[model samples]
Target: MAMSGVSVADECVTALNDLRHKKSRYVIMHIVDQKSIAVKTIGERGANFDQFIEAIDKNVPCYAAFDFEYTTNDGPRDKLILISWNPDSGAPRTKMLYSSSRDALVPLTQGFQGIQANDASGLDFEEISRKVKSNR
Candidate 1:
C-alpha cells in the first residue's frame, strides 16, 4: 500500500539505521505538512527507555524505532521494535493519517516486531516488557 501523497525523509532512514546498528537507542518521528514524515529526535547511544519516551508528547501522533533490551534466563537479549504512538488525545484526522501512512515507514525501519499505543498505560515499560517477552 502506498501513501500516494505522503513521503518519508532521508534522515528518518539514517536514524533507523543508527538504531539498527546500536548507534542510537531510538528514533522519534513526526508527520510534517500532512504530506510527509521525518525524524523529530534521536535518542542518544546508551540512552534508556525512559529517556526515549521523553521525546514523545502525550497528545501527539508519532512513530518510533526502539532498541529493546532485557535479560532472560539464558542471557541478555534485544529486539528492534517499531512503535506507533497515536494517543487518544490526538485529533481523529491525525490518527487516521498515521494508520494509513504507517506501512510506508515500517519497511524503512524494519524492526523485528511492532506495537501500537493510544494511552500512557500502553506505553508503560512493564506493559511493553510483557508484550516483548510474549513475542518470543
Candidate 2:
C-alpha cells in the first residue's frame, strides 16, 4: 500500500516537474518514512524559505504537505499547502488546505497567474502548481 503511494507520487512528481517555472525557485519534498522528509530542488532560490512540498510519495494512512508562498502587494505573505490523495481504499483526487491571516489568493490556475484559498479546499494540483509558479 505504502509502496503504491510512492508510485503514484512518482507520477505527481513528473507532472510537477512539467509544471516547474523558469523564472523562480521552489522546494519539492515528501515524507519517505515516519520521521524523514525527502526533498527535491527546482530552479534555485528561497534559500531562506523554511518548508518543503510534502509529497505523499512517502507517507500513508495520513497526509502530505507542500510548502509555498508568494509576494502580494507590499505587506508579504504565504503558508503551507496540504495535499491528500489517499485516506482510504479508493484513489483520492487531490484536495488542498492552506491558511493565512488575511491571504485572499488570486487563484493559481485562474490565469496561470497564481492562487488562493487561505486554508484547506483549494484546487487541481497542476492548476495550483502552475498558478504558484506563475506568481513567482
Candidate 3:
C-alpha cells in the first residue's frame, strides 16, 4: 500500500509509534486480524476523534468514510483521520492542504485498489436523499 510516495507499512509504523507515546488517550482500531488473499491482509485502524485530531496536528491525515474504509471488530466505523501524509510545505497554504473526511477519493486513491481509498459512489445516495428529503 502506497500513498503519495509513502508506503502504507511506513505510515503504520509511524502511526503505531505515535500511538505508543499516547496510548493512554488513544485506541488503535483494526479492520482485520489476519491476512486474506481477497483483502490483502492490511487492516484499517485509527484512534478516537480527539486523539485523532491530535494525530493530524502531529502531521497525520484523516479520511472520510467515503474516502477510505473504516472497518474493525465492530465491522465498519467512522473517523476523521484514516491515514497520514507529509505536507508539501509548512506555510499557511500547506496548513489548508491537510486530509479530511470530505476530500475526494478518486484523486487520493490514484489507481490503488484492495486497500484503495473509499469510493463515495459505493454509498447509497438515493437512500440518503430520501431521508434528507423526508426530514427523517
lDDT of each: 0.70, 0.35, 0.30
- Residue 125 accuracy (lDDT) in model 3: 42
- Ranked candidates (TM-score, high to low): 1, 2, 3
lDDT of 3: 0.30
Determine which window of 10 residues in candidate 2 has minimal summed lDDT. Answer: 96-105
The count of residue-pair clashes in candidate 2 stands at 13
Per-residue error for 89 in candidate 1, Å, reads 4.5
Better of 2 and 3 by TM-score: 2
The best-first sequence of candidates by lDDT reads: 1, 2, 3
- lDDT score of model 1? 0.70
Residue 44 lDDT (model 1): 69
* Cα misplacement distance, residue 28 of candidate 1 (Å): 0.8
Segments of candidate 1 deviating more than 4 angstroms: 1-4, 45-55, 71-76
Lowest lDDT block of 10, candidate 3: 32-41
Task: Please give, for residues 1-136, the per-residue lDDT of candidate 2 as tens digits.
Answer: 1222222234334434444432334434433442332344432444442433332232232232344565654445443343333323332322211121012112221223333322233336565656555555
Alpha carbon lDDT at 59, candidate 3: 27
Candidate no. 2 TM-score: 0.26
